[PDB]
């Protein structure tokens, strides 16, 4: 217990740093506890805005708090304090990217947790930027693989291949391919870059319309019996089978 009167701002990550209310040399000193560990440090500020530590594994810990209290950057290092093992960057809005590292410092794993709670798990990340990917959603899981170019998550029902492609940077594009030649059931879609909507057109009749929200969900507002107007209203998809039925 450093102090209880001259001290405890409990944010942005699930952590509380104890700013002082000066130290021996003009810099407010601040302390935080992270998983049974005491991280001590100093700062020219008096609002929480770096912390060192040493694990019983001889390792090194360096928690960083931004100068506006909007991020934590909890870094765990090897015994030299330069080669890192695990760097988790949590943000204020509960969005975070956690990473693990190999002996040569390359990224082994990477888990991007969005604000809305949806995850994006990367495993077996090769030295080239590739590996096995998966996306944990609200009510279902998507699966795919990774190349450094794009993150590719694919859903197939029979001949149809629904590919959801993610830019390196966050942008989302969707593709659809069908191997049927029957123009009576050749499921063909046309992406919309603006409204972020995929629009199936089966047998020259638009049969449904699939939006991808900025909140990472999938909607279904089917068209009329002639493919001329939207009938009913959009329903959020909660199970994966309901997506295969969208291609069915």
């Amino acid at each position, epitope marked *: 217990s450093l102090d209880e009167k001259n001290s405890s701002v409990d944010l942005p990550g699930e952590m509380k740093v104890l700013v002082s209310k000066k130290n021996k040399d003009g810099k407010y000193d601040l302390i935080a506890t992270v998983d049974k560990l005491e991280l001590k440090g100093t700062s020219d500020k008096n609002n929480g805005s770096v912390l060192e530590g040493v694990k019983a594994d001889k390792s090194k810990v360096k928690l960083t708090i931004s100068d506006d209290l909007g991020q934590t950057t909890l870094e765990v290092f090897k015994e030299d304090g330069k080669t890192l093992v695990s760097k988790k960057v949590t943000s204020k809005d509960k969005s975070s990217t956690e990473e693990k590292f190999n*002996e040569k410092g*390359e990224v082994s794993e990477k888990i991007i947790t969005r604000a809305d709670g949806t995850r994006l798990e990367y495993t077996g990340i090769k030295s080239d930027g590739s590996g096995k990917a998966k996306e944990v959603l609200k009510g279902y899981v998507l699966e795919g693989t990774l190349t450094a170019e794009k993150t590719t998550l694919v859903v197939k029902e029979g001949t149809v291949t629904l590919s959801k492609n993610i830019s390196k940077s966050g942008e989302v594009s969707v593709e659809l391919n069908d191997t049927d030649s029957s123009a009576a059931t050749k499921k063909t879609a046309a992406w919309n870059s603006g409204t972020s909507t995929l629009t199936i057109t089966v047998n020259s009749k638009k049969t449904k319309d699939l939006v991808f929200t900025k909140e990472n969900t999938i909607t279904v507002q089917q068209y009329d019996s002639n493919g001329t107007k939207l009938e009913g209203s959009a329903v959020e998809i909660t199970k994966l089978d309901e997506i295969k039925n969208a291609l069915k």
Partner: antibody, heavy 121, light 101 residues
Framework: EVQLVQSGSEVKKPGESLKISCQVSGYSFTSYWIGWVRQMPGKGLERVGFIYPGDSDTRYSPSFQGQVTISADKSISTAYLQWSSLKASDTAMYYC??????????????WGQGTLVTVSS | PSSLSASVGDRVTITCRASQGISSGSAWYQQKPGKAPKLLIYDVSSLESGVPSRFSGSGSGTEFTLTISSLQPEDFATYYCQQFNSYLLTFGGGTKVEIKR
């Protein structure tokens, strides 16, 4: 104490092949990366390439891939940078350093003192 | 590159502006004439071991900052800035700090 001792200065003619050494000592040669930097006279630095001696994982700057060749030797803790046929433009000082790999690039922890490479007809 | 004229005791902040900014962090080096550069800052606040506390590094996004609280004589050298952007490769063009008289 960690020391990186590069080979001596070299004077060569367009076409000749050159090897340059860098003998590290003071840390586990294999547990980190080793790399080279090109500093042309009165100019800034240029990352050329890095290797990882633990598995001889070599990675080249795109400005050099095909032009230069990097290797190492665990038994002597030496790193190497070499050319097949030197060009006049190669005339620079080349530094050898220890990289740490921040996602795309290495920041350079320790440096060697050499090495001057004059190349002229 | 660029140059700078300052006297002893002055406070200097070198700014490092990235063209296309996704950087993840930065690093700084000090090169005196005819000598191997020295690592000052990594992971924008480091310090490298053996650097006086008068050296501090901060920044965010595309813009990174190296600062010396008060200049000393040994601090007169060229200073480079390394961003970890996908952009590559050479370095910051360099910034040399000359003595004012």
């Amino acid at each position: 104490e960690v020391q990186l001792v590069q080979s001596g200065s070299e004077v060569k003619k367009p076409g000749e092949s050159l090897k340059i050494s860098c003998q590290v000592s003071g840390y586990s040669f294999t547990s980190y990366w080793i790399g080279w930097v090109r500093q042309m006279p009165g100019k800034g630095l240029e990352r050329v390439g890095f290797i990882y001696p633990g598995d001889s994982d070599t990675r080249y700057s795109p400005s050099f891939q095909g032009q230069v060749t990097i290797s190492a030797d665990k038994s002597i803790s030496t790193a190497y940078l070499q050319w097949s046929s030197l060009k006049a433009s190669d005339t620079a000082m080349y530094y050898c350093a220890r990289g740490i790999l921040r996602y795309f690039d290495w920041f350079l922890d320790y440096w060697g003192q050499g090495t001057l490479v004059t190349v002229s007809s | 590159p660029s140059s700078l004229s300052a006297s002893v005791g002055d406070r200097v902040t070198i700014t490092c502006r990235a063209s296309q900014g996704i950087s993840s962090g930065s690093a700084w080096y000090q090169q005196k004439p005819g000598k191997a550069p020295k690592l000052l800052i990594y992971d924008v606040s480091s310090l490298e071991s053996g650097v006086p506390s008068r050296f501090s590094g901060s920044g965010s996004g595309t813009e990174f900052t190296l600062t010396i609280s008060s200049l000393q004589p040994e601090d007169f050298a060229t200073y480079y800035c390394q961003q970890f952007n996908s952009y590559l490769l050479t370095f910051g063009g360099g910034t040399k700090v000359e003595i004012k008289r």
